[model samples]
Structure formats: C-alpha cells, structure tokens
Target chain A: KNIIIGAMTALITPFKNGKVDEQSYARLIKRQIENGIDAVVPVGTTGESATLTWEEHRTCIEIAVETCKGTKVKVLAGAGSNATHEAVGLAKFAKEHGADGILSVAPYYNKPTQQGLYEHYKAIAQSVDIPVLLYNVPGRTGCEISTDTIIKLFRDCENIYGVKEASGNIDKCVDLLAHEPRMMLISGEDAINYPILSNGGKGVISVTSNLLPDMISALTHFALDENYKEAKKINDELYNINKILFCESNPIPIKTAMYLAGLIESLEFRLPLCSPSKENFAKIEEVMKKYKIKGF
Target chain B: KNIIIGAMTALITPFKNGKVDEQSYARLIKRQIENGIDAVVPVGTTGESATLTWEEHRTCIEIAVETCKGTKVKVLAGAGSNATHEAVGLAKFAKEHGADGILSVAPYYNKPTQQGLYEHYKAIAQSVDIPVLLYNVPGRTGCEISTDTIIKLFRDCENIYGVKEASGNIDKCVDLLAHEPRMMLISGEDAINYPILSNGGKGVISVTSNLLPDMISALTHFALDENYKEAKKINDELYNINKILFCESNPIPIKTAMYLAGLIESLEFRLPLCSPSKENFAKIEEVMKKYKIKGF
Candidate 1:
C-alpha cells in the first residue's frame, strides 16, 4: 500500500442554518480528491470538533468516509476528547464507520500528565482496530505529550502509528523524528508544513487546504520529492495565506474565507465558535485577492 | 464595608492522601486574614477549580467561608464553565453555601462569541442573587471575553458587579477602566496586579499570595493608597515568586509551595493535574528557600 501520507486536508464541515450542508461538504471532498490531496481528515479541530454535538460529530465522519469511499483519498476521522470514555467511544465509532485511520487530539484543558496522556491514547488505541495518529497542539490543549512520552507510547502500542505535531516547536518535532524511526510524523500546522517535512515529517494534516488544496498538495509533494527549490517557492507563496487562515482562530477565519470565496454558503458556526470580526474578514479577503483566488 | 479590595489570594486547596487537607487549608486562610489581606477567593483558578470534583469544589468554597466567617475576608467563589447550566448550578450552589461573591470565568475551550458570552453571563447573573464577578483568562480559556462585550454584559446585568481581569493585556484593562466607571476591575494576574491597580483596577485576586499573603496585601494597600514607591518595591520583590508560581501551570507550583512551606502535608492532584517535573520542583524549592519559607 502507499504510505497514506502527504498533504491531508483537515476537511471543514460546511453548515447552513445551524445544520450540516452535506451537498457543500460532498463538493468539498470531491475538490480534495481532484486537487491531488493525499487524504482527508474529517471532524478535526478545523472541523470544530469541540462544538459539534455527538450526533453531528459521528455524522461528519460518516459523511467523509462515505463520500471518499472507492477513491484513493483516505479518511482519518478525528476522534478525541479529554474524557477517555468518550474518546474510546468515538474511536470505535470511526473504526466501525469505515474510516481508514483515526486522528485523536491530545486531551485538552484537563491537562493530563505524560503518563495520563499515554494511558488515554493507549486506551483509545487498544479499543480501536485502526491506525491511530496522535494530534498534539499544546497551545490550545495547555499540555504537550512530550517526545519521551510519544516514543514510549509508540514503543508500547503497535496501533499508535503517528503524530500530527502542532506543538509549533520545531525542536520537539526533530527530537520525535530522531527517536521514532517506524512511526509516521505529520505537521498539524499549515505555516510550518514545509519546514516540518524538510525536517523529515512524512506529511501535513492541514487547515489552509480547505481553501487551497491543490497548492498545499503540490507543496507537500515537492517537499517529499526532496525538491527543496520548488518547495521553498511554494512555501513562500502560501505563507501569507497560512498566516491569514490562522489570523483569528482555527475554522473561524477559514469558514469565513470559504463563505467569502463562495466555496461555502454561509459562515455558520456553533456557539463559542461564531463569525470572525470585520477586521479579520477584511484581512482574509486581502489574502484571497493576493493569491488571485477567484470567486471571493 | 471597607471596599473589601486589595490583593486577595486565590487560596490553594491543599491535598493530603487524595482528600482536602482541611487543617492546611484553614492555616492558609488564617494566615491571609491575620496578614491583613483584604479578601480570600477559594476554588479559583489558583485553587485548581477544574480538577476539583463538584463536591470537592463546593467543599473548598464552604471551608473558606466557614474558616473566615467573622474575619471580614470576602470569599469570591470560582463558579464558571463552558456549559451554561453547569455554571449556573455552581453559582447557585456557591450563593447557597454563603460565598460572598461569584467569580465566573469566561467559557474556556468552547470559544463562545461575544454575544454568546454576554448571554451566558446574563443568564448566570439573572439566576444568582449575589454579585457576579466576570473572569477573563483567555490564556487558559481559548477565547477572550472582549471589552465591548464585557461592558455590554455589565450594563445589562445588575448583579454583574466586577471582573477578575486576567487577559494579561494592560491596554484592555486601561480601556475597561476608562469606559466603565461603576464596574470594579480586579487583577486576575499576580505580576500585573500593581500595574493594573495603577491603571485604575480596584485590587487583585492573586495566586502568589498563597505563600506571601502579608507582602501581597501590603503591595495592594500601597498601590491603592497611591504609595507607588512602596508598591513598586513590593511588586519588584514578589515579581520572582509570581513568575515561579506559574512556572509549571497555576495550581501545581502554588500547591507545591504550600506543601513545601509546611502548610500542607501532601501534594496530591487529580488525573489531569499531576505532580510537577523534578526540574520545576527544584526551581520552586530554590525560590521558596530564598524567601526563607520554612519546612521544605
């Protein structure tokens, strides 16, 4: 089988009138497949997993799987929570629902210890019969699953296959790569995707790809082929977009950008993840214009 | 009513053998009152409110109220959450248990919008009969309760008396003070307490005060009394302790200091919150010894 690695877009679930716009979502998946994207990770931080109700969470994963079936595109369903039981349940649901792999984020806010993080992931990995990729975004999560902890978890758990490194600390990523030869290492940050891959990351699970899948895919491919010249060019080109995508917060600016780009109908978000400020919206527009991205 | 403002410690709830160490907690509270502290806030962020079970949370609040009943120390109970219902329940419980005020934190992780934040606080303020002090700690929580939204909430709700300004942005504090005259702004951060007070904050809800209550109280008094010279001296002195206490997350270092000072017997914590790393402990101990704190 192919490595199941490269630029996997963390697909955003389009919502209209407080409900999932499945048609737009299906279109989004189709766009990813046509854009040379490696895989599709659904119901992730970019998908607003925290705010998605259980039913919605499950349904989004199911939709991604169902839409991408028979295509080369893989679905790494986001199944994570601070509560171990909920994480286990979500992992099982993802495995049963035809996802090729599972992307489980570090237990956030609750701020688990390294041992507790190992146990949390161990429980989820033990429960599910699928490839498990750890997502570590300490900025949002407050605590990091350290390199030693990840190495230990990898050594012990056969199914714990990789990590989506969003710690934003390049040294941590380099340390993890140096220690774990067998495990997959992917960038969870769009801005650092090229650098992470240059430092031996297998691929990126991206947010900017929601709007620029083809560009991100091309960038990842260049990096993977050791074409540093081309990769650097693409990286510089996409840097501004990456900066704008995260200018406000995850999914907020991206969702707003999608709406402005006419890729999605509206920038409808659940409570707590509402619309972006006018200032941020204008910045998103400027970036889209700079990229010469049509429709917005 | 003596304004009940100054550096009020967000007292740590010491643990022994996995239970609330009432004796140590009482000693901590007594030390603050005897040291001429203006108030004591139990179960606040510095108190490990997130890790405490609902019963344990209430118990800590009740203990603080009971221990300091006739001592003129105002107890601002940490009753906040992402879930509106849970926050309201905690607020009502604190009121019933004789808490002098409620310090409601902005919904962390959930990342509620400004309007959502306003509505969330409005609902809680309407539900409770006691004064509601809004807490804006965006660092721990993923989202910030904006200045416009805060002023709006304060205007709409009668019981919304003040805010524990932990945003760490001096500009925001200055703006709030400039715009809202009636709303009492207290420093939610220890390092910036003096600066905030100088910028028109009433006082602070402090964490470092768990160890140096007398000094913190003195600092606040100096700042409030326009004795900037003495205030700067105390602020400079406590600056190192303030930084060290937060060296490894809020309650961890604070709780460790409490244990080291012979105030608490054990340093037990719930799953998400665990013992600090050996390196962090060493740094904390070094600071404790430098201050001549006994019983490490």
Candidate 2:
C-alpha cells in the first residue's frame, strides 16, 4: 500500500466555454508531475464537483488517469457525494479508470450520524478495491467527520486508509495525532499545510498548488524533512499569497492566479462559477506584485 | 402585494422507492392548508433541492402551485444556487409556473463578497418579475449576507422584497430590524422563530411544520398577534421537538417524524439522505410521547 504522505494537488478542473477543458487539464497534471508534486487529485471541491454533471464527474477521473500515464505521481480522485450509491459509483469509476486512491467527503447537507457516516464510507470501500481517504471539510459539508469517527473508521475498515482533514480545527488535528499516531492524516487546507505537518500531518491536498506547485511542493518537502526553519521561511513568504488565493470562493482566485501566472491560457470557469470582481482582481494583483509575481 | 408573513411550510420532498411521490406530496400540502400554515415553500433546503434533478425541481414547484390552487396559501418556491444564471433561471421558472414568490439563498461554497451577493440577488430580481425573499443561512452558506448588504439590496432592487434570515445570529437580526422595520424579515429556522419574531421578524419558513403544522401555525400567529405570552408557552413546549428535528439534518428527522406521525406513508429519502439512526428515532419518539403529540 502507498503511504498517503506527500504534497498533493486538489487539482482544479479547467472549464472552457461551459465545458471541461480536458486538453488544458492534462497539461495542468503534467505540470504538477514535472514540478515534483507527489500526488494529484481531480474532481475534489476545488474542481467544483458538486454542480458537475455525472458524465463530467466520471470524465474527470478518466482524464486524470489518461494524463498521468508514465508518471510516479499518484491520482486521488474525488468520489464523494451526499448519495451513497453515487459515491460508490464514482469510487468504482475511479478504480476502473486506474486512480491510485479515492477521496470521499463526509456526507454533506443530509448529515448522517457518526454511525451513518461510518456505514456510508464502509459501503463505498466495500464497493471499490482501491484505498479510500476520508475528506472532512465541515465548512462546506455541514458536518464534521469527527476525529473519533476517523479513528474508528481506520480501525474498522482495512481499505479506509487515511483522512484529508480540512476542518480548520488545528487543536482537533493535534488531539487526533496524539491519539492515533499511525493514521495517515493529510491537510485539506493550503494555508495550514505547514502547521498541520508540524503537528504530525503527512502532507496537504492543496488548492494553491494549481498555481504555485513549486512553492507548495517546496513547503511540503521542507516540512516533511523536519526542516522547520526553512519550512516557516517559505510559509511566511507565501502566507499572504495563500490568503489572497482563497479571498473568493476557491478555484476562482486560484484559477485566476494561474491565469495571472501565465500557467494557463484563460481564467475560464463553468456556470455557477464566474470571474472574480474587478476589486478582488485588483487585490489579487496587489498581492502578486508584493510577491514579485507577474503575467495574466 | 401580499405581506407574505406567517408560518410557511418549508415543504418536504416526499420520495418513495427512488421516485418523487407526488400523491404523498399533495397530501402533505393539503395537511398544511388544513392545519393553518400561512403559506408553503417547495424545493427549499428542507425539500432537498440540492440533490433534485432540474425536471424534478421544476415539477416540485408546479405541483405546489397546483396543490395550493384556489386556496389563499402562497407558494414561495426555492430558487437559489451558486450560479447566478441558474438562480435566475429557476426564479423565472418558479414565477412562470405560478409561484407567488421566490426565496433566493446566498450562494453557497462560492463565498462571494457582500458586493457579489448584492449583485447576484439584484440580477435575479431584475430577471424575474416576482417578490424575491433573500435566504441567509450562513451556517450552511459559509458567508454572511451582511446586514449592510441586506439593507442595500432591499433599498436598491424593486423585486428584492423580503429576507428569510436563517443565520441564527439574533443580534444581527435585532440590529437589522431596528434599522429597517418595514423591510420584510422572516425566520428561516424552526427553533429560533419566536426569538426572531420577538425581535421583529414577521414569521418563519419552518421545518417543524412538516410534522406539526398546526402547532407551528398557532405559534407564528400568536407571535405576530403580539400574544408573546401564548407564543412563548407554545414555543417552550415545542422546544424539544425543534431540537430533535434538526438533530440529524434538515428534512431527515422531520421526514422521520412525519412517517411516525402517519402524516406520510414512509420516511423514504433520496440518495445522500439516508434514514436516521435507531437511537435518534427512539429519542424523537420519546419526545413526541412526552409532549402528548398524537400519531408519532
């Protein structure tokens, strides 16, 4: 089994004229791989999987597999849904499409009890052969898959490999780490990657990496190596950038940042996603200048 | 223009065997009307609109319109989304399908700026020729449609008629009411309906009504008639029921309560919305019995 520990991209799904931009998406994956990103995850929240059509959702996983061919970079496809059957279907698709692992979010909206959550994920894991990592972002999901639940899931399911803990409750992370030291805990937030890693998380599944893969990759490597001084140095340097990246709803600012970085051709987005306001764009540009970044 | 105040049922979307059970839904609407619900809202969060297909969404609104025909009850349809264009489309669809009003929620997950929220609602109001009630559930939406922004939208957009304040921050509601007493404010939550109304909100778009429409209607009417003593009496009596309804998630426990009440055939739900745990169901039953609530 692979160690679920390293820098991973919460890969952004590129949209061109209201459709998935697969060619550009493939290029984005290649860039991450070439830039030394340890893993790449497609169809996560950063990819706007919530509003995605079922076909687009499955297609994203397929594109991820097709693009990452011949690369050591692992693909962690997003297979979460409030629906158990949908989750299972997506997870199975990821497995069939050759994804290395599946990232399943705790059921949102129809928040199940801890037992319900356990059963939901257990059903998916039972349905698929691949390793499963729980994605807990209570801010969006409306419920936290608590640390206790995470530990229980780890104990209960062999294939329930790890967690992408994005609750932003750092104290909970520390507590979980202290209690279950062997579980693979990954940061689901970009800004707290260094702090999470310092407190014993393995790495982060980051949104900022869509634009700054090298900086994030460097931060993760430094943190993993116990090079705290260097890690904090890089973290401080990119702290403001990370803040600006999430200034608007995710992938919006990050996608715009990539456009500004000249890493992508356009700051295109699907419906439900629109370009940032001129004022936000100005704020982002100011941060870019402060960081000596240029280009959109 | 109607005041659009009082106990509004945030109607449940009844599903049976993986299909929308229209017969049960019509019965539910009839129950609300007979029990004295002031108005009815279909396809709102309580209706599980997030997971409903587009056709089903439209049909839910149409069915509500048909069910409430010739009755004084108004159909305030759920017409909200992260996508402004989609929200406008839904709002227009609701209006075209004979909905009396639209409850537009703040864009979820996107976390748009106050200005963006203003623009989003403004655009929808402009596109649809109907009363638009802003729904603000920051706990679910991750962004507060600030008091300042609400007042601005109310003042600027002609169709931006009222607000369904669900943020649960009573102080914010108090502040808004003090500043703009004429601005229509309705509670979008079940538990806090009395406090909100006490602080000057007109009524509520309620969830508990799915199970106890008569009780909720009486509570709202007492509150509005300035019969606080009676309102408080009813509210305190129903407090436990309110808590249990949301113990798991919106509509889940309410659906369960309805099923137990024999108001609905089964507590069937769509994917992503599984059944409540046995412990939760037992607790709900205990509360119902303690309250001397019949049926459930």
Candidate 3:
C-alpha cells in the first residue's frame, strides 16, 4: 500500500516577476521524472509553501499531479500546516487532485504537545484516503514527532505510511527503524541519505534533487538496491554540494544554484526567504563548478 | 509617536461552531477597554493566528480597529507571518483599517538568517505608516531576533517602535533597556511583567490579561508609576495563575479558563489546538478558583 520510496525531489516553485512561473514549474517536474526520480514532493519546505498563497499551493499540487499522470512518478503533495484544519483541507485537496500521497509536517511554531501532534497527524490522515508521510523537521518546525508517537500513528492510522525524519538524530532514526521496520523511513536531509537508506530507510525526500535529480536518484537507488559501494561513492561525491546547499537556509542556496545552473529562468523567492548572502553566493557558485549540474 | 505601551491584552479570539464569534470578539475587546487595557492585541498567537483563515485574520483586525476607534484604547493588531509579503499585507490592512500599531512577529518555521530577519522586518515596517512592535518569541518562532539586528531596525526604521520580548531572558531585557532607553520594551510573558517594567521596560502584552484585564492593568500601571511594592504584590498574588496558564501551550488553558468563567459563549478552539489534558483542565479550574475572576 505504501509505494512512496526511492528518490523524490522536493521541487522548488519557480517564480517570475512575482508570480508562480507555471511554465518553469511544469518543466522542473518533467525534469525530475526525466532524471529517473521515483517521486515528486511538490510544495514541501523546499517549494517555499510558507509564502505561497492557498491558490499557488493548490496550483503546485495540480501541476504535479497533471505532470506525473500516466507515469511511474508519484505525487506526494506538501499538505502540512500548523493548523489541523488547513492541513486537512490541503490533504483532502491533494487526494482530490490525484496525488499519490501527502507529506504532512509536524505543526511548526505553535509547538503542539505529543498528544496534540498525534491528533494533528491522525486528523489529516483520516481526512483523506491517500497515504500520509509525517514530516519531523524539528530544526524548521521547532518540535519533533517522537518514536513512540510515530509508532502509535503507524499502527493506528492505516493511511499514515511513515515519517520524513529530518531531526538529524541517527539514534532516533535507528530506534524508529528497529521498532517499525516495515514503516517507510525516508531521509529528509540530503547529507545523510546513504546512512538512512543503509539503516533501512526506504529512500530520500530530497532538496538536493531539486537541482540534481539524476545524481540524488542514483545515490538513493544504489543504496536501496544494496549497492552501498556506489551509494557511498555518490554520497561522497555530492557531500560538498549538500553541505553548501544548507550553508544558508535551504532553497536559498538550492534555488540560487538552480538559477546558476539555468534550471529556472528567474531567481525569485517569496519574502522572508530572499537571495543568499554574497559570501555564501560565491561559495555556492564555487562548489557547483565541482559537480555536473543540469543547465538550461 | 510609539503609543503602544502599558497594559495590553493579547486577546484570545473566541471561536463558535468553527467560526470567528464576532459578537464574542467585540465583547472581549470592550471588556479590555472597560477594564483599563491601554491596547488590545487581537489575532496574535493567543488569538490563534496560525489557525485562522485569511478572512478570519482580517476580520479580527477589522473588529479590533473598529471597536477601539472612538476610544483611547489603541488597537495593536497582530499582523505577523513567517512570510514577509503576508506580514506586510497585514500591516498595510491594519493601517488602512485604523489600527494604532502592528505586533509583527519574527518569521517562524523558516528560520531565516539575521540578515533575512532584518530585511523581513524592514520590508514590513517600510510598507506601513503605523507603529510596528517587533515580537521576539524565540521559543515559538524557532529563532530569535538578535540584539544587533533589533538595534539596527530601531535605528534604520523610524516607525519600527520596539519589541515584545517574550524570549524570557531578563538580562536581554535589561540590555535592551540600557542600550535603547527610549525603546518600548513590553513584556510578552505575563509572569515577568513586573520585572520587565521595573527595569524601565514600557509594559506588557499579556495572555493573562485576556481574562484579568483589570488586574493586569493595575499591575502594569503600578510598575509604570515606580510603585514596585504594589506591582510586586499583584505579581506575587497572581503568580500561580500566571504559571498555570502556560502549563500547556498557550491559548489552550487561557481559552478554557475563559469558557469556565463564562467569558465566551463557547469553548471552541481551531485545531491542532484542542482541549487541554484532563489533568490540566482540572488544574486550570482549580487555580482560577483561588482568584477573583470575572464571571457572567
């Protein structure tokens, strides 16, 4: 029932002249599918969903579903919010729009309790028939979905497939894997894809893949297929880029890299998430020269 | 020019049947005004800004501005978002609708760099003519607005009034008070209202004030007048209730307290914030009994 595995791009929504650059967005989704990406997680954090209007959010999901239709690439729509009602609305919309699953993040900022987190995710999962991937990016969300909570969610909610563990705690990841070995433990941080996959995580929901889908796909598939040698090699090869992409807050470096690589026409992010610092910009450019990124 | 000071209630938005209870909302504002609140901060975190729809957010601001227009009571609307554009839009709306100021929080979730934080706030401040009170709730925002950035904003932006320092660091408050002696250093936490004001800070934007507006007002006024004896008395008197209010995530216990006291028509909260735990519910009730609370 849970087929959301292997490499998936947390695709960034391209903006041109302060509006959703639908043309470039669709092209980017196609680029991911062409690059052998297993799935496309649109409007996730990398997509800058926090700034996108409700219309733009729905549009991103619609485009992802339409772009990947009749293809093996699954759509895991970003349908997360600090508000359970809003999350449920997005989750229902994602299921309605033909998304294969929904990536529901732990409530950010508000800092819900363990029981509140459980209720939040369970409510979203029950709202739709699609599989729900609980997101635990404590760095971004300011809270964590505990191992016990994850185990309870997986057991109770039939549609709660697994979690996108981005807390960067390998021990917790190991504990999660040990307890719910059948649960899909996808990697949220690109830097640790191999470690997670080697330890029984299904695959990665990648921000790095937004720019280099093929490379990330190669890395995850190699690890998923038990070819740790190739996986470790790719991981080592992409290590600097991964580290630098997050040197600044995410998507800032990734989006800038994309614009530099000619992946998108314009380098625009919604406010609060603006261009990278001059020093980081130079570093991003310097680092990318070491890798063969796809250019326009 | 920066008139947002003294006792203010970070008003709880009353919800009924999953909608903004406009009547209850107006009554709450009136209650504050009658009870000697200098300003009413609606649609703040206490107001459940994260859960409210765009329409609901705007309506709360509209109600606040309208209710306070003819009186001396100022409407410091909660115009905050992790998205800068959205925050700017809310600030602009608040100004257009006749709010005296905006309580703009630091971008949560998408933890921006200091430069990003500076730019995010500068953009919002520049867009509106009204006073803009910067909110620094590190625990809630997953980030902090650093002292240098705060000083820079105060120097650069004329209408960038001061800060609602909820980080719970009294030393930082003392430092802010010492550095920018003219800056309005309002306490965002109720428990430390006396400490913040006794150190030359202006006042408090309080959650406790949502129910005990008169008592909070008296405490703030006493501190403002340098009557630490009376201020400390009230602080010590209400210490238990103030501590218990935050026993769970805010607005949960406060909202429940309101319902039990017949302050609001219904005890509704937009999820992912639901009813408090059974133990907490009883504790909140038990604590309130010790105080002379307003009841229907």
Ranking by TM-score: 3, 2, 1
List residue ranges in candidate 3 displaced over 4 A. none
Better of 1 and 3 by DockQ: 3
- How close is chain B to the truth by TM-score, in each candidate? 0.95, 0.96, 0.98
| A27-47 per-residue lDDT for model 3 (tens digits) | 999889988899999898899
- DockQ-derived CAPRI band for the predicted complex in model 2: acceptable
Can you tell me which runs of candidate 2 are displaced by over 4 Å?
Answer: A1-4, A16-20, A51-55, A225-229, A268-280, A289-296, B1-3, B290-296
Per-residue lDDT of candidate 2, residues B71-141 (tens digit): 98999999998768789889989988899889988877656667678778888988877889998887777
On lDDT, the candidate that comes out on top is 3
Score each candidate by Cα lDDT. 0.82, 0.83, 0.90
Candidate 3 residue lDDT tens string, B156-224: 999988999998899899888788887888899888888888999888999998878889999999999
lDDT ranking, high to low: 3, 2, 1
Best by TM-score: 3
Please give the range of 10 consecutive residues that has the lowest summed lDDT in model 1 chain A.
Answer: A287-296
The per-prediction tally of clashing pairs is 2, 3, 0
Per-residue error (Å), model 1, residue B243: 4.1
